[PDB]
Every structure is written in C-alpha cells, then in structure tokens.
Design a protein around this ligand. Structure first.
Ligand SMILES: *[C@@]1(O[C@@H]2[C@@H](O)[C@H](O)O[C@H](CO)[C@H]2O)O[C@H](CO)[C@@H](O)[C@H](O)[C@H]1O
Ligand SMILES: *[C@@H]1O[C@H](CO)[C@@H](O)[C@H](O)[C@H]1NC(C)=O
Length: 298
C-alpha cells in the first residue's frame, strides 16, 4: 500500500519525541535503565547531527550488591496502529550478555495489545529474530511467502511459553557483529489489519528499495519485494490482537533470555552473565546503537 510520512526522527529529534523509561527491567536483566537527563549527563544517549547513539556504560566496574549496568530504553511518545516504521541502523549493540531490541508494544495491557519484535537477539548470536507475542488464538501457517525461516508458529504467550511466533532472518549480517562489520542496514515493518511484515536490507544491498534507503515522504510497499518475515492473518486476526503500540529501542543485559547459563555459555561467553557484565566494562564499548533515522508512515 501507499503511505505518507507521519514522523521523521533524526538526531536531536529523538529527545523530544521519545522518553527514556527509567523502569525496573521487565525482562529481569543486569541493567539500570536511566532517565533522559541521566542518560544525557552520562553520555549514554547522544543525539546530534544525523546520529543517535544509545549505549551501555563501558567504564564502571559494578558493585555486585548495587544496580545493574547503566543503559537506556527509549519509547516513542506517539502510538501507532496501521503504519510502516523504517529504521536506518549503522550499528547495534554487541558483546557477551547483550540483549538489544527494536520493537513495538502496548506495555499497559501486555500481551493483549500485542508485541512485534523487529530487531532482537542475544549474546551476539546471529541471525536476527522477528517475533509476535499476543494473547489467545493467534497462530501462523506452516508455509507463507517470506525469505526467513519460521521457528514457532503459535504467537499466544499463554500457550507457547512467551516464545511468541518467530521468524529467523536468512543471513548472518542481519544481526550482531556480522551486521556491525557490514555497516548495519535497514529494517522496515509494515502493520495492517491483515498482516505484519518485516524486511531487512543489508547496508551494501544492491536491491534495497529507494523508499526504504532514502526515506522520501511517500512510499509504496507494493514495490518492496518479498518480506523477510511475514505474519499473515490466516490463523490470527491481526487487528484484534494488536492495538495502538509505542516504538521501543533498548539494550538490556543477561535476564530471562540472554542470562540463561545454557544460552550465555552456549554462545561461548565465559562464567556467569551477571559476573561478566559487572566486571568487564571495557567489553561493552561496542554495546551501542548508532541510528541514522527512524521514520514512520501512515
Ligand atoms: C516483555 O518482554 C519482551 C519479550 O517478549 C521479547 O523477547 O522482546 C522484548 C525486547 O527484547 C522484551 O522486552 O515485555 C513486556 C512489556 O514491557 C512485559 O510485560 C513482559 O513481562 C516482558 O516479558
Ligand atoms: C559522547 O559520545 C559520543 C558518541 O560516542 C562521542 O563522540 C563524544 O565524544 C562523547 N562526548 C564526550 C563529551 O565525551
């Protein structure tokens, strides 16, 4: 469909159009999410020119008894239903223990207002995962047109184990150190009543739609080729499982996914996640988002 620019966020714009959520981490990570004033004072958020940086503290050795590693979780003030969101991302956090995400949800009624994870993973483990989390009666067909690979087809968190219904991107450079070495790329998500789609295009893609790469004020997703992840309405009333969602971009550490010993050690990371995060500040120098723009269309 054809959509038109609704929000154009670059650099300092994010400081007026998002807030920082200074909240206990819902995912129980070894993180201290700071507010906007604190993030700016500590240079954990840097928002100027055509750059937004969102980063972990990479200097403090943590008291094991004290709070987690300082980081940020930013949330759009506006909410969205049928829309397209495009993320031009130069760098995403990397490092053992890291759990970055770019996603949408309604925190106030979770999971009943839905959740779509656009960029997400843990402990540098490529590829990217794109996932819906919903309430009851929302599943995905075994076969549908997309370039990625489905991993779980029941989206209902109550009957899947909060895995959600996920799709793995087909290339390594969708995530992690591989993505960063390649200069990142573009993630786009289209949500309608009938489906959710996510596309990933590498920075060096010869075939990235101009609509995505250059951010004109008018776009037409008919022209974007096959999505990386497709969540059709075959077995899920998409519109009834999602309501008005905020956009969230965050970085946590350890917690309910990344911090599991089998997962953390399985990735080759040493010892316990919490001890690693406490004691290795320098290892988080590359635990940053560098975002060129986020644009929303409706
Ligand atoms: C919930 O957590 C989500 C999780 O479902 C997904 O793996 O990706 C998100 C970002 O990585 C992560 O936050 O978040 C909701 C809303 O904050 C909570 O209600 C819920 O308890 C978390 O599990
Ligand atoms: C804050 O972080 C930015 C981005 O990493 C960096 O370029 C800058 O030098 C830092 N500012 C100060 C005053 O140290």
């Amino acid at each position: 469909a054809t959509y038109h620019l609704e929000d154009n966020w670059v650099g300092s714009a994010f400081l007026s159009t998002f807030t920082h959520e200074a909240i206990a981490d819902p995912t129980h990570g070894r993180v201290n999410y700071v507010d906007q004033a604190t993030a700016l004072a500590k240079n954990l958020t840097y928002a100027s020119g055509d750059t937004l940086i969102l980063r972990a503290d990479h200097t403090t050795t943590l008291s094991p008894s004290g709070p987690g590693r300082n980081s940020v979780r930013i949330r759009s003030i506006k909410t969205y239903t049928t829309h397209v969101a495009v993320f031009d991302v130069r760098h995403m956090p990397q490092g053992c223990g890291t759990w970055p995400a770019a996603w949408e949800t309604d925190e106030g009624d979770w999971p009943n207002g839905g959740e779509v994870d656009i960029i997400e993973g843990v402990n540098d483990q490529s590829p990217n995962a794109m996932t819906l989390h919903t309430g009851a009666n929302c599943a995905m067909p075994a076969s549908r047109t997309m370039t990625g690979h489905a991993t779980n087809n029941n989206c209902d968190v109550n009957t899947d184990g909060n895995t959600g219904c996920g799709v793995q991107a087909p290339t390594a450079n969708s995530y992690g150190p591989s993505f960063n070495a390649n200069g990142g790329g573009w993630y786009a998500m289209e949500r309608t009543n009938s489906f959710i789609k996510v596309w990933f295009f590498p920075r060096n893609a010869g075939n990235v739609p101009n609509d995505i790469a250059s951010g004109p004020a008018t776009i037409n997703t008919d022209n974007w080729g096959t999505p990386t992840a497709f969540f059709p309405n075959t077995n899920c009333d998409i519109g009834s499982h999602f309501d008005a969602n905020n956009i969230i971009i965050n970085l946590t550490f350890c917690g309910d996914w990344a911090g599991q010993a089998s997962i953390f050690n399985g990735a080759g990371c040493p010892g316990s996640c919490v001890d690693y995060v406490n004691n290795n500040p320098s290892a988080f120098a590359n635990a940053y988002w560098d975002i060129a723009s986020v644009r929303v269309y409706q």
